[PDB]
Write a protein that binds this DNA or RNA. Structure first.
Lengths: 141, 50, 48, 81
RNA sequence: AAGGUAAGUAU
RNA sequence: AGCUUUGCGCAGUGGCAGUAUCGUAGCCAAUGAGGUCUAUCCGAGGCGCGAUUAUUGCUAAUU
């Protein structure tokens, strides 16, 4: 949660999105002190080395950097968004919101699969990718 | 507080004890079951006439 | 109504009675075939 | 104490038989593999934040988490106390 | 009330 | 004068297996590697790391 790089103003976020031309820019919008953000950041930290070939992970504090709250509807405790070549890559998670991951995941392989799907779809030149797993339900039994 | 700066520097790095095979195993191929399994399954259904 | 799985499973007690009767019948048929030095055919053990 | 080299035909002092033989049969494939490895580990961008950045992030977390740190305990997200 | 947005390029 | 043994090359033909082949200015090793069986006996490489379509090239297609 604290081992990941941080972006401290909107210009830094724009540059991080613009800098990467061959990798998915995974940016988590939230607060390091929020428990949901702590879970999501732990998951991202567990996979940060694995996906470094095709993904880069940044963390942004939405109070320190409020320049995207109105734009990206960052009014949730945690939010993960995907950008590839200065384009926001939407993902059809099945949750009704195709723009972001607004909850916290528990499986590293889940997040890695989502990142890989986003990377492949964005490389092919697509603005929306279909998630390998549906999230219309939590699969709790 | 009493940890000297030399002790602070002398902290060792953490090294993995697993070897190359454990850390980075070669991809494990999946292969179909041999045809003898289908042959024996179809032979199981055969029955004597006496 | 779709059929219920229970109606097509023979109960344990009736199945044990049937097993006793069927194996007694098979013993009788086998003894009869021994007297003829003949091997039981699939048609002999058809109702069983 | 000069022994004829079985691989080059020259003469080396006996104090350097084993090292000359080991070096003489050194595959250039080793050189190219080492050069490739040097190129790879000196060009990959660091994934995790530097140490001072980690310390600053932990300080911010402690400031904004008084249910774990500090003396007085404010709410989970508040920083005043 | 939702879990039912194709991603676009043009005008 | 022929014949023939061993090792090393160079080729030719043929067979077999691709869960394996290499690399070691890394380490240890006949001053003993490694030992389930045979232990007052066995005797040679082992380990770590790296490369990879489980060796690597061309050629022909589609592109």
């Amino acid at each position: 949660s604290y081992m990941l790089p941080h972006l401290h103003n909107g210009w830094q976020v724009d540059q991080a999105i613009l800098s990467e031309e061959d990798r998915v820019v995974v940016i988590r919008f939230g607060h390091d002190w929020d428990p949901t953000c702590m879970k999501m950041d732990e998951v991202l930290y567990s996979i940060a080395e694995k996906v470094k070939n095709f993904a880069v992970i940044y963390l942004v504090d939405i109070t320190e950097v409020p320049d995207f709250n109105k734009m990206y509807e960052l009014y949730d405790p945690c939010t993960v968004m995907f950008f590839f070549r200065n384009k926001h890559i939407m993902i059809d998670l099945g949750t009704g919101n195709n723009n972001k991951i607004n909850w916290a995941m528990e499986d590293k392989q889940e997040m890695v699969d989502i990142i890989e799907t986003v990377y492949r779809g964005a490389r092919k030149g697509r603005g929306l990718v279909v998630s390998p797993k549906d999230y219309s339900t939590k699969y709790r039994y | 507080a009493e940890v000297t700066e030399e002790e602070w520097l002398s902290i060792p790095e953490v090294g993995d004890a697993r070897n190359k095979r454990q850390r980075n195993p070669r991809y494990e191929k999946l292969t179909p079951v041999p045809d003898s399994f289908f042959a024996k399954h179809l032979q199981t259904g055969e029955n004597h006439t006496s | 109504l779709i059929p219920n799985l229970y109606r097509y499973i023979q109960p344990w007690e009736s199945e044990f009675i049937d097993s006793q009767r069927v194996w007694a019948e098979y013993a009788l048929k086998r003894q009869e075939a021994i007297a003829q030095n003949r091997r039981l055919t699939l048609e002999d053990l058809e109702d069983s | 104490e000069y022994l004829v080299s079985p691989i080059t035909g020259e003469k080396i002092p006996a104090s350097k038989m084993q090292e000359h033989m080991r070096i003489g049969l050194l595959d250039p494939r080793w050189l190219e593999q080492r050069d490739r490895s040097i190129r790879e580990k000196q060009s990959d961008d660091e994934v995790y934040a530097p140490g001072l950045d980690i310390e600053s992030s932990l300080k911010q977390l402690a400031e904004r988490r008084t249910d774990i740190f500090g003396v007085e305990e404010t709410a989970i997200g508040k920083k005043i106390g």
